[PDB]
Amino acid sequence: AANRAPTSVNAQEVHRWLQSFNWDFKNNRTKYATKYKMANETKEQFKLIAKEYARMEAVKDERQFGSLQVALTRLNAGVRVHPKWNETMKVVSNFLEVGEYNAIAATGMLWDSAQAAEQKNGYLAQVLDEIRHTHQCAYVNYYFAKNGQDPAGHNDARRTRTIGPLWKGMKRVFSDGFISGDAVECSLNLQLVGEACFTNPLIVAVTEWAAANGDEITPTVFLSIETDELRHMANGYQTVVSIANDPASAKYLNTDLNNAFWTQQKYFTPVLGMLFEYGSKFKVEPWVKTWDRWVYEDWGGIWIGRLGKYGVESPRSLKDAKQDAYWAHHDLYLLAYALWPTGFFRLALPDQEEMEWFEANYPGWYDHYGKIYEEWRARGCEDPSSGFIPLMWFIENNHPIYIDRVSQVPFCPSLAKGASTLRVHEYNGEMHTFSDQWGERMWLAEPERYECQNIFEQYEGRELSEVIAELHGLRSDGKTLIAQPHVRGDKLWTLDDIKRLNCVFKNPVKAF
């Protein structure tokens, strides 16, 4: 029996008093350098408490892991995916994994920066979400390694990623850019630009291409990840709202935003276009179309437009970004393929249908890239017995490949249908190579922030097979390379095939 209606208390009823949890003391201030003042009293959109946060995420996990462990496994979904996509997912899942990971630290920094309890609380949920995402991306690679057609790379990307050049650029946008700098600049890189402009649309697009390529594992996980992203957008919006009524905002916000925007697009523009168009059999949409909608229209227009009332304006480098875009991903794949022995994934030359698709969507593609790929195939780039690596063609044709000192994006000025700009400076006994006016200014103004050693500096004078060997770029048989210049089941290249080529790295800037 008894008397009194069953009653309880929910998240909102507790959250109502959360702002009051913080109290005043002289040293109650952020531990991180910043030009800005995050207003105390700043509120958050989602009225969450730790227990309700856990419950909402647990239900999602239930669904996700249920699908993966039961039906998808029974359907052998880890196997029935196009070979090319199995390879792309090694990079997509592990590279995204590092962004999820650094985003945990970034939001810890933002939690520290915020003075209002609600704002700290908003960043806190994202701290927990990014841990969730780290483990989810890790799980995608775990699953493909456990149940797929080629586990190598999926099973050790955390260490095999270190052999190649594309990884350095990923660390710039999704690791260091997220945590090294004024907390606000990091927030712009992470939330306002990174998540709002690239990650949010990318995650869903990835599920589209995955599905097209027979992969139902990625949609299951990535669609679950995307359900948390709304709260992260709010955190980014809140960052701007929190600092907008301070004099520092008028002086600094737009340059931090412009620098963050350039930073993010510099890598994603060529890389994501490359992963989509060249890492798939079935295509969903040409990247030129996608990029314009995502960056120029959706983000550059609408999203940013909602921040105009806080003094935010369109990045001054947006025009430059659009101009450099068109051929960016095509230019990059040439280098990624030429340097295939340095990866932790297998790559393929575009087949006849793809070349036709490329030309139809990018007039002039065949005359430049198409002919080159055909020449490389004739030289025997797919065959272990050829003794040919495309990098050899770059040397024979006087086409040096440089690494941008700031973004880490590889570029070949003399070949590129895109940018073709190159700036080389010598300073205090060291030379630096830049690919654009924005990154050049970043280094000139902040040289001590950009001292990253490039692949050619570290591997200088080293023979390729010894680098691959020391960095564990081999499959379990201890001889066959993880990376390959084709996605077929045989004629796989071995360490000895690489050793016989006797490719010894040289620092290209030494030509100057």
Q: Which of the ranges 211-219, 303-311, 384-392, 411-419 carries the binding residues for other proteins, by CB under 8 A?
A: 211-219
Residue given tokens 């691959």 in the structure block: 468
Contact status: 62 vs its own copies (CB under 8 A):
yes
Give, to the nearest 10 degrees, the angle between helix 200-212 and helix 247-278.
Answer: 10
Per-residue tokens: 299: 């983000």
Q: How far apart, in whole angstroms, are the C-alpha atoms of residue 232 and residue 121?
A: 12
Q: How many CB atoms lie within 10 A of CB 481?
A: 25
**DSSP bridge partners of 484:** 346
Q: Could you say which residues in the range 324-343 bind other proteins, by CB under 8 A?
A: none
Q: Could you say which residues in the range 217-246 bind its own copies, by CB under 8 A?
A: 219-220, 223
Contact status: 496 vs its own copies (CB under 8 A):
no
Q: How far apart, in whole angstroms, are the C-alpha atoms of residue 438 and residue 75?
A: 49
Could you give the 3-state DSSP secondary structure of residue 410? strand
Contact status: 97 vs Fe ion (CB under 5 A):
no
* CB-based contact 418:328 (threshold 8 Å): yes
Q: Which of the ranges 23-31, 60-68, 340-348, 397-405 carries the binding residues for its own copies, by CB under 8 A?
A: 60-68
* CB-based contact 45:234 (threshold 8 Å): yes
Q: Which of the ranges 127-135, 170-178, 383-391, 420-428 carries the binding residues for Fe ion, by CB under 5 A?
A: 127-135
Residues present in the chain in total = 512
Q: Could you say which residues in the range 52-71 bind other proteins, by CB under 8 A?
A: 52-55, 57-59, 61, 65
Whether 130 has a binding-site annotation, put simply, is yes
Q: Could you say which residues in the range 182-221 bind Fe ion, by CB under 5 A?
A: 195
Strand 423-427 relative to strand 410-411: parallel, antiparallel, unpaired? unpaired
Contact status: 75 vs its own copies (CB under 8 A):
yes
Q: Which of 64, 149, 254, 494 binds its own copies (CB under 8 A)?
A: 64
Q: Which of the ranges 153-161, 269-277, 363-371, 494-502 carries the binding residues for other proteins, by CB under 8 A?
A: 153-161
Q: Which of 54, 70, 250, 504 binds its own copies (CB under 8 A)?
A: 70
Q: How far apart, in whole angstroms, are the C-alpha atoms of residue 433 and residue 454?
A: 10
Give least dist CB 330 to other proteins, A.
Answer: 23
Phi first, then psi: give them for residue 285, nearest 5 degrees.
Answer: -170, 145
Give least dist CB 263 to Fe ion, A.
Answer: 17
> Measured from the CB atom, is 236 or 390 closer to Fe ion?
236
Give least dist CB 20 to its own copies, A.
Answer: 31
Q: Which of 223, 233, 392, 431 binds other proteins (CB under 8 A)?
A: 431
Whether 446 has a binding-site annotation, put simply, is no
Give least dist CB 281 to its own copies, A.
Answer: 20
Q: How far apart, in whole angstroms, are the C-alpha atoms of residue 334 and residue 374?
A: 12
Could you give the 3-state DSSP secondary structure of residue 344? coil
For the chain, the C-alpha Rg in angstroms (whole number) is 24
Q: How far apart, in whole angstroms, are the C-alpha atoms of residue 244 and residue 307?
A: 10
Q: How many CB atoms lie within 10 A of CB 233?
A: 16
Contact status: 413 vs other proteins (CB under 8 A):
no
> Measured from the CB atom, is 40 or 64 closer to its own copies?
64
> Measured from the CB atom, is 75 or 360 closer to its own copies?
75
Q: How many CA atoms lie within 13 A of 175 on its CB side?
A: 12
Contact status: 256 vs Fe ion (CB under 5 A):
no
Q: Which does 67 bind (CB under 5 to 8 A by kind): other proteins, Fe ion, its own copies, none?
A: its own copies
Q: Which does 88 bind (CB under 5 to 8 A by kind): Fe ion, its own copies, other proteins, none?
A: none
Whether 440 has a binding-site annotation, put simply, is no
Active-site residue (options: 137, 197, 381, 412):
137
Q: How far apart, in whole angstroms, are the C-alpha atoms of residue 332 and residue 267?
A: 10
137 assigned to active site: yes
Whether 425 has a binding-site annotation, put simply, is no
Q: Which does 511 bind (CB under 5 to 8 A by kind): Fe ion, other proteins, its own copies, none?
A: none
**DSSP type of residue 484:** B
Q: Could you say which residues in the range 248-267 bind other proteins, by CB under 8 A?
A: 248, 251-252, 255-256, 263
Instruction: Give the largest Cα separation in the chain, rounded.
Output: 91
Give least dist CB 302 to other proteins, A.
Answer: 25
Contact status: 426 vs other proteins (CB under 8 A):
yes
Contact status: 100 vs Fe ion (CB under 5 A):
yes
Per-residue tokens: 100: 């999820």
Contact status: 71 vs its own copies (CB under 8 A):
yes
Whether 133 has a binding-site annotation, put simply, is yes
> CA 338, 341, 343 angle in degrees (round to 5)?
95
Contact status: 285 vs other proteins (CB under 8 A):
no
- CA-nearest of 450, 340, 348 to 403 is 450
Per-residue tokens: 173: 């946008």
DSSP state string for 362-402 = STTHIIIIIHHHHHHHHHTTT-TTS---THHHHHHTT---E
Q: Cite the active site residues.
A: 137
Residues that bind Fe ion (CB under 5 A): 100, 130, 133, 195, 232
Residues that bind its own copies (CB under 8 A): 62-72, 74-75, 216, 219-220, 223
Please report, in range form, the residues annotated as the binding site for Fe cation: 100, 130, 133, 195, 229, 232
